[PDB]
Amino acid sequence: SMGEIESYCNKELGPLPTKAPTLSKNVLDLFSLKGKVASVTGSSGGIGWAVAEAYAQAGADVAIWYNSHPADEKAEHLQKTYGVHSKAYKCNISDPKSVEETISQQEKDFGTIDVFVANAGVTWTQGPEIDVDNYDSWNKIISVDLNGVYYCSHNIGKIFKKNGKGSLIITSSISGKIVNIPQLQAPYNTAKAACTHLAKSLAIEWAPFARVNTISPGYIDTDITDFASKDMKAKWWQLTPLGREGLTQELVGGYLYLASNASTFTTGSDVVIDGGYTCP
Amino acid sequence: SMGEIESYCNKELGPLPTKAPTLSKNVLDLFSLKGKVASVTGSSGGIGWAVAEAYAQAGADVAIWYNSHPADEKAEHLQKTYGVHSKAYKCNISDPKSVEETISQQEKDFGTIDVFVANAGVTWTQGPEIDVDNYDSWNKIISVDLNGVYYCSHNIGKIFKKNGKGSLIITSSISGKIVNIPQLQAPYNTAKAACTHLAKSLAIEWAPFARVNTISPGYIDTDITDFASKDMKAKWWQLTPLGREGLTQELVGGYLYLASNASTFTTGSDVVIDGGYTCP
Amino acid sequence: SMGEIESYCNKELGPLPTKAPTLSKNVLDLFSLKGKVASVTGSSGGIGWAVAEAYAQAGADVAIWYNSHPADEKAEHLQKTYGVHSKAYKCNISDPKSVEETISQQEKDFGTIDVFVANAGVTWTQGPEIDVDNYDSWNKIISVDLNGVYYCSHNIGKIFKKNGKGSLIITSSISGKIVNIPQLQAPYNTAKAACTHLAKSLAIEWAPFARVNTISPGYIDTDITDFASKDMKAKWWQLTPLGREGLTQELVGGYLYLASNASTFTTGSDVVIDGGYTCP
Amino acid sequence: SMGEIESYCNKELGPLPTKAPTLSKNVLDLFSLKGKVASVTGSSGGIGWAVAEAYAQAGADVAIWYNSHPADEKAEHLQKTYGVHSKAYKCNISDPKSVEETISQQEKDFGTIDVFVANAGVTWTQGPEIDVDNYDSWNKIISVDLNGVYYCSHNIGKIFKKNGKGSLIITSSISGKIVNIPQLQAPYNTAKAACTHLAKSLAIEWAPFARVNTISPGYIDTDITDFASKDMKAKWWQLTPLGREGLTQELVGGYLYLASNASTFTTGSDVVIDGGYTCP
């Protein structure tokens, strides 16, 4: 440590400045995932399936994840339609040994993992916490929506570090930045705020070998909000600047942006896709 | 619900607008805690003891909490020095039954609780997470620094709702807004970001009967940072606009502001006390 | 520059660490303004008058400012009621020469200025900008609500630097963080966001000799919102977690917190007093 | 307004919910600008030229803007290399009549404008403001970096409203979120914070007919930072989690994301591209 500029963030970067990547000079080539492997949790569900198919369209091999709804059909659909390799894996994301085994098997099956999306999650549907005295509900939210994200993150970081490259995207929510109304869901908001700032924290720790970012969707038309009444959804619309819920196909551009070489200087960022909801 | 303005936030507010409290005409009297009971977790430690003593100086009865460092002498010091009632209580904040029993016993011993400070916490000192396997350290941080805060909140909210009044303050950190460097501590930062947004979420849910806010300190000269080498602290000072660490006496004004009638329109807020650290 | 820790923020701090202030060990003494001089712009108006009187109650001499409504009566009320020195000054805050002359005269009249509140401001009342083609309205908002704040700031910083001490508070708004609805007021929101981050920027530049912070009120019952219809105010109430507008007397605790020795480690912070409005 | 869900944000949306657009089934086609016209201010300079060329690569006709550095050869380069229409225009962005005339002439020359990037800007290089008297430098920053951005926005909004579609991107900066060190530049930071919140405010006002977003770059290797000594840049690198400055090619993916149908539910958002700078 003489004659070196040492990072205040992370000395594993080595002597500063680090070298910039060599990129295509054409912007469209930056979004290609040809030659890359993506792994997407919760891809039996609405957002995860849309992201999985978009990544296959961009050229990636795709590992699909499910728990209570088998998705082998879905992996086979990607193989037949786009000619990529795709396989589906069953895993309860709450079980850290299962997450480790699943990610290790995917590395064997596909050779490596270049892009990881920690997307699986569940809602809180029980109203104000003051009336919920059984902590099982709190524990469930924290276990699936925070611990499960961390188990995925801890395991994939080791692969990214071994290979010297990677992009991790965590699906957070506008709930990590604001307090949803009129449905009261403090435990879910808490878990999502934790996810957003876990991502920023890992962006510093992993900077020598990977990027880490969040996508924070607003209200998207999937089954996850099927608990909402029609008067509840109407109030969401009234408070959304664009005046509606979004579709899953309006998220896939952002997931591909973060996954690909279009975003090689983007890390620790929270890409909000919410029709303006967090602005008013 | 005809001819009433209903809240989009919490319809338990009743017909809108709600009504403001009467307040002392002298600004200094707004800060008084005469006639009030405060309960401060982690008040065998640095910040918690300073807050407990400040609250006694402002006239409050004070319940003190400890775990590994018995604090009966601190409670006796408050009685002898300020003439308030004080008693110290042992509780592992990770144990939800013990938290419930301790808060119930304090309500019975003191009659009520008007002000609650969820302040107890532990640091992460293991360095970058990628090398910290099995999940015992992660679980310890989440258990004490998030679950313990939620156990306290769930229980005190019931007392505030029964009484129709209360102020809850959660000690978060600048680590809830930024990523500390060079000491890498993703799990701690994650827990504190969760704390900050749990407070905002509870501010909506408890609005008919209580206010909820956080204090986010920067680097304060206590023991929680004694893992810090001379060169690590020097870097903190270089990045702090005021050029130094803070004293616990520089926090107590903000804890008194939030606890008292000085802040009756303040809820869901994060009062940052950090020498400017989060600005660069 | 050998054998000194030099700040990365501001080398005028001198060798690090800077020295902590010597404070009272009693929390209530920290809020005293005895022996100090405060100057409050817009103190013919609602918020500024409440703050001026609170500072006099805390022991400060107070310089009052007006433009279209003379406030000599108000200064005399402070002298007769609290026994402090108080004088009122006429100044169009849009005129930089007038601001400089006013602040220079106050320094002569009172000896020094210890606390400055840049509070004067006007609303935008003309609806969506797309239909306002005369830039006079934009220029007015920027001139009074941003340039005027900067003219005050630039002048008072020179006094604070000469004396080595000072606290500057800028009245911003929740409009600096969110987008008000349903009244569309982009130019005012823009000016207030500028004020909030001007304060953070000056906190770094002035750190050797002064603190700089904002108060960001939510909806407060003053004349400034008298353009609002009753259906407009009802929607504000529906979106405010506490369910109502605030009173000016619910702000004065925060202004005294920031003005006094209760906040000597607080700089570059934005103290939000909004009934929770910015949370949902 | 009976039997219609009215917006609380902008009742010009009409009865809610609004309806989503049809989108290409292939994610890569979402990023195409074939058939579209883009207008990019400051595209004689570093970032602006990179964005203009990227938009031509994606198929757009491009209007180029310059002030002191004539750029007809850049426009001819886009025509010869990509087969798009391109023309360069001279305009002092501080002059509102000239901005209006330039945007009107581009609408006539190209037929319409679909994508507008308000990117032109100048730095503050005077150091701490306290020593910079008279207000000419402050006025220059506000005039170019805020007023000029507003003049562009006011005019293009009229075209977007007439056509019922459009995407406006404002180039802000990390300086809109944090306070740069060690180079002290409060007026620039103030202008960029204003830009970021002007964009959010316009996102609500323009929601029936356009999206509005910002790109906030960190330190990018262009000429705008040539005032920077070797030791100043070294400190920037030490505080940047990725350990380096970014390339303009690392920004164009984000500008294409926001300009195109990849982001039809994205409005009021701030896409930060900073190597992690705003996270510590």
Ligand SMILES: NC(=O)C1=CN([C@@H]2O[C@H](COP(=O)(O)OP(=O)(O)OC[C@H]3O[C@@H](n4cnc5c(N)ncnc54)[C@H](OP(=O)(O)O)[C@@H]3O)[C@@H](O)[C@H]2O)C=CC1
């Ligand atoms: N839709 C929206 O409005 C928003 C959603 N989000 C987030 O988006 C992500 C996807 O949610 P979305 O697609 O909307 O809802 P879905 O319910 O459609 O998808 C949920 C997914 O999570 C998986 N999952 C649930 N629990 C577990 C578990 N214990 N172990 C493993 N996988 C599990 C499900 O797998 P299976 O069905 O096979 O059990 C399914 O694939 C979630 O993190 C959600 O919080 C964030 C913001 C807004």
Ligand SMILES: NC(=O)C1=CN([C@@H]2O[C@H](COP(=O)(O)OP(=O)(O)OC[C@H]3O[C@@H](n4cnc5c(N)ncnc54)[C@H](OP(=O)(O)O)[C@@H]3O)[C@@H](O)[C@H]2O)C=CC1
């Ligand atoms: N720079 C700083 O000092 C900063 C601190 N903070 C936060 O401030 C709060 C106080 O920390 P500080 O006073 O600095 O550190 P201390 O270590 O001095 O105080 C720690 C306190 O937490 C209590 N505690 C620890 N574990 C448990 C447990 N399992 N159950 C119950 N109580 C427990 C300790 O009790 P005992 O000693 O009796 O076991 C002690 O009272 C913490 O939340 C910390 O994260 C935030 C920002 C900055």
Ligand SMILES: NC(=O)C1=CN([C@@H]2O[C@H](COP(=O)(O)OP(=O)(O)OC[C@H]3O[C@@H](n4cnc5c(N)ncnc54)[C@H](OP(=O)(O)O)[C@@H]3O)[C@@H](O)[C@H]2O)C=CC1
């Ligand atoms: N009330 C609210 O809901 C909120 C208000 N604010 C901010 O609070 C501050 C005070 O506003 P408030 O008290 O509510 O409204 P008032 O209209 O009651 O007070 C306005 C004050 O500004 C002064 N002023 C206006 N223009 C000028 C000028 N050109 N030169 C000098 N002084 C001038 C007026 O002086 P005179 O009357 O003598 O001309 C008056 O003292 C403003 O910055 C406002 O933006 C922020 C958030 C919420």
Ligand SMILES: NC(=O)C1=CN([C@@H]2O[C@H](COP(=O)(O)OP(=O)(O)OC[C@H]3O[C@@H](n4cnc5c(N)ncnc54)[C@H](OP(=O)(O)O)[C@@H]3O)[C@@H](O)[C@H]2O)C=CC1
């Ligand atoms: N690190 C960086 O480079 C960062 C830059 N930014 C922002 O990016 C944008 C581009 O800056 P960059 O490309 O880096 O710097 P350049 O100096 O390379 O580009 C400056 C551009 O602004 C134009 N311009 C300057 N003054 C005027 C004016 N009065 N009227 C019209 N056009 C004008 C110049 O035109 P001409 O040369 O023809 O006069 C040139 O096209 C700016 O808004 C800057 O604040 C934000 C974050 C980081």
